[PDB]
Design a protein around this ligand. Structure first.
Ligand SMILES: Nc1ncnc2c1ncn2[C@@H]1O[C@@H]2COP(=O)(O)O[C@H]3[C@@H](O)[C@H](n4cnc5c(N)ncnc54)O[C@@H]3COP(=O)(O)O[C@H]2[C@H]1O
Ligand SMILES: Nc1ncnc2c1ncn2[C@@H]1O[C@H](COP(=O)(O)OP(=O)(O)O)[C@@H](O)[C@H]1O
Ligand SMILES: [Mg+2]
Ligand SMILES: [Mn+2]
Lengths: 81, 404, 654, 163
C-alpha cells in the first residue's frame, strides 16, 4: 500500500485534507495564478460538500490528487506559492 | 493610600498552585500577569498560565532562585509590572523583600512593612497581642539564653515548647531534652531562616488549632471571614483543614473571631492575614499571625462567597472593602455550610512520607457538585523533580452539612 | 460569574478536535448576555457572534522550521549533524567613559566631527567586523542573533572607535534572501544596543544597496530612511570612480544631517610607470573634485588589497597635501601586507583606517584591529583604541565564528596572486562557484589568468561590484568557448556575450575612465541601445504612493517607509522574504547552530520569541520516512506533546 | 638569521624592520601554510620589500605556483587544524609559544578545565614571573604550563605556594 504524501504540519503553503472523504472536482491546475478566497477544489465528507479556498494570493505549484480520488485526513491536496 | 497604587500588570513572586491561583484572580480583574521560574521549574504549569514569564536565579540552586530578591525585582521592572504578589512561603513574610519591592516603586500586595516586622517575628507578635489585650500563652519575657529557658521551666514546668522567632520548634519534656531541644532549634534557625533568636512557651496538651481569616483595607475597615479548624496535623504540619470549626459552639467561635479582629484593629492591619490560636476546654490562646494569604484560604472562600485573593489585590489598589470591593458589614458576612481541604502530594505514606519523584503517566481529576480543585504541577507527562514541595493538587469539598 | 466564565473558557487547552469555545467566548462578551436581557431570538439575530479571530500560532511555525532543517538540512550547505557548542565567552571589560564621535555628531553636527578627526593625533579606527569582515570570510552570513550578544560590549568597551561599519554592501540582500531576517530590524536592534557608536554603511552612489537602475528620488528616499533609522556615516562609492553617480547621494547625506565620505576606488599601481592610467595625478585630480562636492571625508577603497606599503605612503602623503578633508583608508589583508600598509599610511598622516577584530581578520578580510595597535605602540603615532578591551571582545567573536564553519571560503591565509589578477575577495569565491557549476573548477588558474587578460582587453578597468562581475563573466565565457582575444575581434559578431558584459558596454554601469575600446564595444553591443550619460536619468519613474498601495495589497498590511524602499530595491527578494516569514516565522531569533542544523534527538533548546515569551522545545522522536517521504517528529513544546509531519526530500529525490 | 612567528599579525612588519636593520636571513613559510602561529609568508615579504631599498632573494612567481600545491595539500589535514588561522595578540601577555598553547588546551581538557582556559593563560603569566621571568621554549615552556595548570586545579595563589 503506497502511502499518500501528507501536508506538512504548520506549512500554510500546503493544504491537507481535514476529514476522510473524496475529491469531487478540481478547479485549477499547476501554474495557475489565484487570489485569496478563490475556490480551488471541492471535496466531500459523508456526502457533505466542502470547497477548498486559497489561503492567500499565489501561484499553484501542483496538485497531488486527481478527480474522484479517495483521501484521508492530512493527505496533501494542493500546494501553493 | 500609597502613590502608584493603580495596576495594569502584576507579577507573582512564587510558583506552583498559589501562582496559578493569583493569575486566575488577576485575569478576572482585567490585569495582565507575569511569572518567574527557576530553570529546574521550567515545566511548571504556572510558567505557562501567565501572560508573560521570565527565568530567574540563573546558576543558583532552585530554591535560592525563588529567594533571589534582586532578580525578581529586575524582572518586575523589566516587564513593566505594577505590583508583586508574594503568594505564601518563600519571600512572602520577608521584610527585606517587601522593603526592596516598595523601594523599587512597586506595589507589594501585602501588609505594611511594620506589620511584616512585628508579625514575622513571633516574639514581637506576642508583645503586640498583649498590648491589644488578646490572651497569649505564658512564655518568656523576650528571647532567652539556655539559663532563662531553664528558668521558665522552673517557673511553669514541663512540658514546654521551644520555638524560634522565625519558624523551627521542639517539645521538651525534661532537662535533657531542654539542652538538646534548644541546641537543635537554634541550629535550624541560623540554618533555614538566617537568624538564631529563641523563646519558650508552655506546651498545651491536645489543643485544637483555630485560625481566623482577616481582611483590612487602607480606610480603617477590618473584617473577619470566620475561622478555620486546622487541628488535623502530622508532626505539627497541617494535613486537613475545615471551615468553619464545626466542633465548637458558634458563640465560642465568634469570641475567637472578635479577639482576632481586636488585634488587627489595634495595629491597623492592611490586606489579608490570619490570626492563629490554640484552643483547649473553652479557653483560647494567641500563637501567631501569618501576614499573608494561606494555602487553606480556599475553604474560607467557599463558606463565605468572598474571593480572598481578588480582595488582596483590590486592597493593594487602595480600594475600600465595602464601598468598592462590595463586602457587607461583619454581621452580614455569609456562613454557608462547611468545606474541607486536602492536599494531595507525592509523599509516600509507606515510605516514611518521603516525596516520590518521576513522570506522571496518568492524571484524571474529578469534578461535580461540591468539589473545587486548585492544581499544582500535575498533568500527564510532567516530571516531578526533587527540588520543590510535593504538592500535586489541592482538593476542597463543600456542602450544607459537614457529613456530606 | 461572567468574568470567571470568560477566564475558564480562555484557559482551557484542548487539542486534536475542534470545539465551540470561540463561539461561547463571543456570546458571553455581548451586552445582551451580560445585562441579563437575552431573549430566545438574540443569537439567531446577532451576526457578529459568528466572527472568529485567527488563533495565533508562532509555536507551530517554529516546529515546522526546526523539522525542515533537522530532516532536510539548510539549503546550499551540507546536511550534517549538529555539534554541541558552549556559550560564547563574554568579555571582562575595564570601562572608561568618553565622549565619542557619535556624541559629537548628535550634539554639534558633521563638521564638528570632522574637526574632532583633524585634531586627533592618533590614527582612528573603524571596525568592519559587522560588515566587510564577514562579507569577505563568511559569505556575508553573520547573523543579528550573534551580533546583538556582543554589541553593547563594543559600544561601552571600545568608545574610541570612529565608527562601526555595519550595513550596506552585500548585507542588505543577503539578510533578506539567505538569512530570512530584515536588514532594517538588524539596524534598529543594534542602534539601541550601541547608542554611542557611529554606524557606517557602504553605499553605492547610483543605487544604494541594489543592482537595478533606480531614479534619483528612490536614492534620496533610501538615504532619508537610513539616516532616520540610525545610519551616521555613508561611504559613497562608484564602481568606475564616476563622479556624476555620486553627487546627488553626497548632497542628500549632507541634507539629512549625516556624514558623507566620498570614495575613491584604488586599482593598479601608482609605483608602476608602465601603467600611467591610474597614476598619482589621476587620484589627486579625483580627490580635488570629490572635495568640491562638499563631502566631509575622503575614503580610499582598496577593494582588492593591492596597495603595497611604499605605494600607500606615497598615495596618502600626496593626498594629504592635495585636499584638506580627513582621509579614511580601507584595504584588505589578502596579500599578507595589510598591517604594514596601514602602518605606512599612518606614518603618511592617514586619519582613519578600517580594521576587523583579530578573529575575523586576515586573509581576504581587513587587517587586525589588535595587531595594528601593537605595530604602532612604540612608534611616533599610536592607534586610538582600548586594546585590552578589544582582546576580551575578540574571545566572543572567536567562539561565534565556529558556528559559521559551513560558510568558510577555505583556510584563512595570505595569497599574493591578487597583485596579478586584481579580483576583490567575493569576485574570487563567486568566480570559483560559477566555474564549478559549469564544470571548469579544474581550470581555475586559467580563469585567474583570463580575468587578467580580460581586464586589459576592456581598457584596464576599476574592478569592484559590479564591474568586477563583468570581467569575471567574460573570462569564464571565453574559457568555456575556447576564445582568445584575437577570436573575439575576429568572430565576435556571431557570438552572444554575457549579459553583464553587454550592460557594461551599453553604459548601464556608467562611464569608465578613458572610455571604452571602440571596436570591441561595437562588436559586443550590436543593436542594443548605448547611453553615455548617467543611467539614473533613464530610470522608470517611481511613485511612492502607487508602490506603497501595490505593496500593501501584496503583503496584507500597511508597509512602513523602510519596507517600501526594500521592495523597490529588491522586489522579488522582498516578496520571497514575506513568504518565508509567513511559513517559518521570525527565524532571526534562533541561535545560529539551530538555525543551520535544526535539532538532535533528545536535545532541548529555548527560543526567546518576545520579551517574556520563551519556547522550550525538546525533540523526543524522529520517525522513519514512509515511502512517500512522510516523517513524523514528536516534540515537546512547553509541556505539550506535538506531532509534526515533514516531508523528507531525499526520499522524494531518490 | 631571524626566526619569528606571525601569531600577533605583526610578522611581516617585523621582518621588514629587520631587513632595514641589515638582517642576513629570515624564516618564512609558503603563503598557504603561513600566518597565525606559523611563520610570516614568503611571498608576502617579497612584495613588502619589492619597492624598498633592499629586496628579498626569491623567485616569487615560482613560489606562487608552488604555493598552489600546498594549498591543495593542506585541505587533507583539516582534522588536525588547531582552529581558524587568525592573529591573536594575547601572546604578548602570556608568552606561550604555539605548541605550548594547544597542548596546554588539551591538558586542561583531559582534566576538565577547558572552561577556565582564560584563567590558565593568566596563571601561565603569573607563574612565569614567580619563577623569576624565564625563557619559555620547549621544555621550559612545559614547566610553566604544568605549574599553572596544577595551581588552578588545586586552587592556589602565589601566596598559597609560599605559605
Ligand atoms: N629607525 C627605526 N627605528 C625603529 N623602528 C623602525 C625604524 N625603521 C623602521 N622601523 C620599523 O619598521 C617598520 C617597517 O619599516 P620598513 O622601512 O621596513 O617599511 C616601511 C616602508 O615600506 C613604508 N614606509 C614608511 N615610511 C616610508 C617613506 N618615507 N617612504 C617610502 N615608504 C615608507 O612603510 C613601512 C612601515 O614603516 P613604519 O614606519 O610604519 O613601520 C616601521 C617601524 O615600525
Ligand atoms: N505552645 C504550644 N503548645 C502546643 N502545641 C503547639 C504550641 N505551639 C505550636 N504548637 C503546634 O505546632 C503547630 C504550628 O504552630 P505555629 O506556631 O503556627 O508554627 P508554624 O510557624 O509552623 O505554623 C500548632 O498547630 C500546634 O499543633
Ligand atoms: Mg502556623
Ligand atoms: Mn572592502
Amino acid at each position: 500500500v503506497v502511502a499518500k504524501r501528507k501536508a506538512e504540519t504548520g506549512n500554510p503553503n500546503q493544504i491537507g485534507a481535514t476529514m476522510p472523504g473524496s475529491v469531487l472536482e478540481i478547479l485549477v491546475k499547476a501554474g495557475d495564478k489565484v487570489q485569496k478566497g478563490q475556490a480551488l477544489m471541492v471535496t466531500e465528507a459523508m456526502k457533505m460538500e466542502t470547497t477548498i479556498e486559497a489561503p492567500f494570493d499565489g501561484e499553484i505549484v501542483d496538485l497531488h490528487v486527481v478527480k474522484g480520488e479517495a483521501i484521508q485526513t492530512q493527505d496533501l491536496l494542493i500546494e501553493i506559492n | 493610600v500609597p502613590r502608584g497604587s493603580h495596576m495594569k500588570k502584576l507579577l507573582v513572586a512564587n510558583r506552583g498552585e498559589i501562582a496559578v491561583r493569583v493569575f486566575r484572580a488577576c485575569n478576572e480583574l482585567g490585569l495582565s500577569t507575569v511569572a518567574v521560574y527557576a530553570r529546574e521549574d521550567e515545566y511548571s504549569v504556572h510558567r505557562f498560565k501567565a501572560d508573560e514569564s521570565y527565568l530567574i536565579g540563573q546558576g543558583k540552586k532552585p530554591i535560592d532562585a525563588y529567594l533571589d530578591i534582586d532578580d525578581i525585582i529586575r524582572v518586575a521592572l523589566e516587564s513593566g509590572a505594577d505590583a508583586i504578589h508574594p503568594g505564601y512561603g518563600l519571600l512572602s513574610e520577608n521584610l527585606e523583600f517587601a522593603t526592596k519591592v516598595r523601594a523599587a516603586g512597586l506595589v507589594f500586595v501585602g501588609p505594611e512593612l511594620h506589620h511584616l516586622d512585628i508579625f514575622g517575628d513571633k516574639i514581637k507578635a506576642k508583645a503586640a497581642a498583649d498590648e491589644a489585650k488578646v490572651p497569649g500563652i505564658p512564655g518568656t519575657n523576650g528571647a532567652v539564653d539556655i539559663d532563662g529557658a531553664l528558668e521558665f521551666a522552673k517557673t511553669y514546668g514541663y512540658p514546654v515548647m521551644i520555638k524560634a522567632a522565625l519558624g523551627g520548634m521542639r517539645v521538651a519534656r525534661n532537662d535533657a531534652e531542654m539542652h538538646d531541644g534548644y541546641a537543635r532549634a537554634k541550629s535550624e534557625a541560623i540554618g533555614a531562616f538566617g537568624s538564631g533568636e529563641i523563646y519558650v512557651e508552655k506546651y498545651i496538651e491536645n489543643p485544637k488549632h483555630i485560625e481566623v481569616q482577616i481582611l483590612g483595607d487602607r480606610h480603617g475597615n477590618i473584617i473577619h471571614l470566620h475561622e478555620r479548624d486546622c487541628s488535623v496535623q502530622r508532626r505539627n504540619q497541617k494535613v486537613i483543614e475545615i471551615a468553619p470549626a464545626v466542633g465548637l459552639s458558634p458563640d465560642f467561635r465568634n469570641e475567637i473571631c472578635e479577639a482576632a479582629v481586636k488585634l488587627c484593629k489595634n495595629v491597623g492591619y492592611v490586606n489579608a492575614g490570619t490570626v492563629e490560636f490554640l484552643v483547649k476546654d473553652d479557653k483560647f490562646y494567641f500563637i501567631e499571625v501569618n501576614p499573608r494569604v494561606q494555602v487553606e484560604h480556599t475553604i474560607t472562600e467557599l463558606i463565605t462567597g468572598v474571593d480572598i485573593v481578588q480582595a488582596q489585590i483590590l486592597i493593594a489598589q487602595g480600594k475600600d472593602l465595602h464601598r468598592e470591593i462590595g463586602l457587607p458589614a461583619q454581621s452580614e458576612i455569609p456562613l454557608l455550610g462547611s468545606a474541607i481541604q486536602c492536599r494531595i502530594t507525592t509523599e509516600d505514606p509507606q515510605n516514611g512520607f518521603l516525596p516520590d519523584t518521576g513522570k506522571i503517566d496518568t492524571y484524571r481529576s474529578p469534578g461535580g457538585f461540591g468539589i473545587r480543585l486548585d492544581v499544582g504541577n500535575a498533568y500527564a507527562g510532567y516530571e516531578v523533580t526533587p527540588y520543590f514541595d510535593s504538592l500535586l493538587v489541592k482538593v476542597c469539598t463543600f456542602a450544607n452539612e459537614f457529613s456530606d | 460569574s461572567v468574568r470567571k466564565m470568560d477566564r475558564v473558557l480562555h484557559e482551557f487547552r484542548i487539542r486534536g478536535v475542534k470545539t465551540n469555545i470561540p463561539f461561547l467566548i463571543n456570546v458571553i462578551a455581548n451586552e445582551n448576555f451580560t445585562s441579563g436581557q437575552a431573549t430566545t431570538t438574540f443569537i439567531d439575530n446577532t451576526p457578529s457572534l459568528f466572527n472568529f479571530p485567527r488563533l495565533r500560532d508562532r509555536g507551530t511555525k517554529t516546529l515546522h522550521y526546526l523539522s525542515m532543517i533537522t530532516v532536510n538540512g539548510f539549503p546550499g550547505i551540507e546536511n550534517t549533524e549538529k555539534r554541541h557548542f558552549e556559550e560564547p565567552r563574554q568579555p571582562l571589560l575595564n570601562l572608561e567613559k568618553k565622549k565619542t564621535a557619535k556624541n559629537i555628531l548628535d550634539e554639534q553636527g558633521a563638521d564638528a566631527v570632522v574637526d574632532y578627526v583633524k585634531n586627533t593625533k592618533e590614527v582612528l579606527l573603524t571596525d568592519t567586523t559587522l560588515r566587510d569582515a564577514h562579507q569577505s570570510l563568511l559569505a556575508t552570513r553573520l547573523r543579528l542573533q550573534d551580533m546583538k550578544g556582543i554589541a553593547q560590549a563594543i559600544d561601552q568597551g571600545l568608545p574610541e572607535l570612529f565608527s562601526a561599519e555595519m550595513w550596506g554592501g552585500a548585507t542588505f540582500d543577503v539578510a533578506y534572501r539567505f538569512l530570512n531576517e530584515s536588514p532594517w530590524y538588524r539596524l534598529r536592534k543594534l542602534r539601541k544596543l550601541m547608542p554611542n557608536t557611529m554606524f557606517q554603511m557602504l553605499f553605492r552612489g547610483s543605487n544604494a544597496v541594489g543592482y537595478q537602475n533606480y531614479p534619483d528620488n528612490v536614492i534620496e528616499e533610501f538615504i532619508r530612511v537610513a539616516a532616520h533609522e540610525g545610519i551616521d556615516v555613508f561611504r559613497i562609492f562608484d564602481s568606475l570612480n564616476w563622479l556624476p553617480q555620486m553627487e546627488k547621494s553626497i548632497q542628500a547625506v549632507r541634507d539629512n544631517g549625516k556624514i558623507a565620505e566620498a570614495t575613491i576606488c584604488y586599482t593598479g599601481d601608482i609605483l608602476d610607470p608602465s601603467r600611467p592610467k591610474y597614476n598619482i595625478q589621476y587620484y589627486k585630480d579625483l580627490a580635488k573634485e570629490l572635495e568640491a562636492t562638499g563631502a566631509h571625508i575622503l575614503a580610499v577603497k582598496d577593494m582588492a588589497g593591492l596597495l603595497k606599503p611604499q605605494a600607500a605612503y606615497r598615495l596618502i602623503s600626496e593626498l594629504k597635501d592635495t585636499v584638506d578633508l580627513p582621509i579614511h583608508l580601507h584595504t584588505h589583508d589578502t596579500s599578507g601586507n595589510g598591517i604594514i600598509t596601514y602602518s605606512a599610511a599612518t606614518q603618511a598622516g592617514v586619519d582613519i583606517i578600517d580594521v576587523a577584530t583579530a578573529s575575523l581578520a586576515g586573509g581576504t578580510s581587513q587587517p587586525s584591529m589588535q595587531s595594528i595597535y601593537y605595530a604602532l605602540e612604540h612608534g611616533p603615532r599610536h592607534a586610538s583604541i582600548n586594546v585590552k578591551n578589544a582582546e576580551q571582545i575578540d574571545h566572543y567573536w572567536e567562539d561565534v565564528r565556529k558556528y559559521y564553519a559551513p560558510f568558510e571560503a577555505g583556510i584563512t591565509s595570505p595569497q599574493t596572486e591578487v597583485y596579478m589578477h586584481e579580483m576583490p575577495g567575493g569576485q574570487y569565491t563567486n568566480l570559483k562557484s560559477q566555474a564549478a557549476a559549469v564544470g571548469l573548477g579544474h581550470r581555475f588558474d586559467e580563469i585567474k589568468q583570463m580575468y587578467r587578460k580580460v581586464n586589459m582587453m576592456f581598457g584596464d578597468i576599476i574592478k569592484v561590484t559590479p564591474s568586477s562581475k563583468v570581467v569575471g563573466d567574460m573570462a569564464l565565457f571565453m574559457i568555456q568557448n575556447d576564445l582568445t582575444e584575437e577570436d573575439v575581434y575576429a568572430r565576435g559578431n556571431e557570438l552572444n556575450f554575457p549579459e553583464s558584459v553587454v550592460s557594461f558596454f551599453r553604459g548601464d554601469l556608467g562611464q569608465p575612465v578613458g572610455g571604452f575600446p571602440e571596436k570591441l564595444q561595437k562588436i559586443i553591443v550590436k543593436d542594443k541601445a548605448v547611453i553615455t550619460d548617467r543611467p539614473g536619468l533613464h530610470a522608470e519613474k517611481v511613485d511612492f504612493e502607487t508602490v506603497k498601495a501595490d505593496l500593501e495589497q501584496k503583503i496584507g498590511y500597511e508597509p512602513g517607509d523602510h519596507e517600501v524602499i526594500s521592495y523597490i530595491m529588491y522586489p522579488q527578494v522582498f516578496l520571497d522574504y514575506q513568504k518565508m516569514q509567513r511559513e517559518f516565522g521570525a527565524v532571526t531569533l534562533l541561535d545560529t547552530p539551530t538555525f543551520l542544523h535544526g535539532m538532535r534527538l533528545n536535545e532541548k533548546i529555548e527560543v526567546q520569541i518576545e520579551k517574556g515569551k520563551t519556547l522550550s522545545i525538546r525533540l523526543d522522536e524522529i520517525g522513519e520516512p514512509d515511502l512517500a517521504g512522510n516523517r513524523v517528529l514528536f516534540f515537546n513544546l512547553n509541556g505539550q506533546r506535538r506531532e509534526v509531519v515533514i516531508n523528507d526530500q531525499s526520499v522524494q529525490a531518490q
